[PDB]
Amino acid sequence: MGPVWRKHYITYRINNYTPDMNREDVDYAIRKAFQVWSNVTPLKFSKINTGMADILVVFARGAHGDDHAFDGKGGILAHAFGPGSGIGGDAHFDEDEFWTTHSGGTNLFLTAVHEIGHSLGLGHSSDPKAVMFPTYKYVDINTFRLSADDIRGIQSLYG
Ligand SMILES: COc1ccc(S(=O)(=O)N(CC(=O)NO)CC(C)C)cc1
Ligand SMILES: [Ca+2]
Ligand SMILES: [Ca+2]
Ligand SMILES: [Ca+2]
Ligand SMILES: [Zn+2]
Ligand SMILES: [Zn+2]
16 A cells, blocks of 8 residues: 555647648657656656547647637647646647748747646746746757746646
């Protein structure tokens, strides 16, 4: 007797894949985006296309009943939630948009780091250097790191 856990394994699955690029790249961006946080936090992400996952990545295109569901080339990028019931855990992205591996446009990996942040449950940061922030900035993948302000935020997640 002695049940214990604290996430450990973030099992995730994508609902569909942006045909805009090669699927490999599509999951690569979101994979890597997770991985970034999965490196810093003790969380261990795991994509599984075959089975049942804990969270779900909802790429939807100008559809689904919401207030700000999704919209075309601009407007909403993506919205997702960690600490909540039902949808909580799961992460929704504007498939309507033409996301790009290259920085030019909207980089999937870039936005993904923030939405993955939502799913893990990180609090909205308030510094332009953080990626969890509600704002956007053209972060250079050359650097590939999280801000100090961000890092305290993520470590706030005891699990
Ligand atoms: C890190 O990637 C982001 C991309 C877009 C935005 S946004 O400012 O266009 N926006 C969407 C968003 O925050 N998604 O998580 C909120 C908007 C209502 C101002 C924010 C972060
Ligand atoms: Ca949009
Ligand atoms: Ca959920
Ligand atoms: Ca798309
Ligand atoms: Zn929605
Ligand atoms: Zn946000």
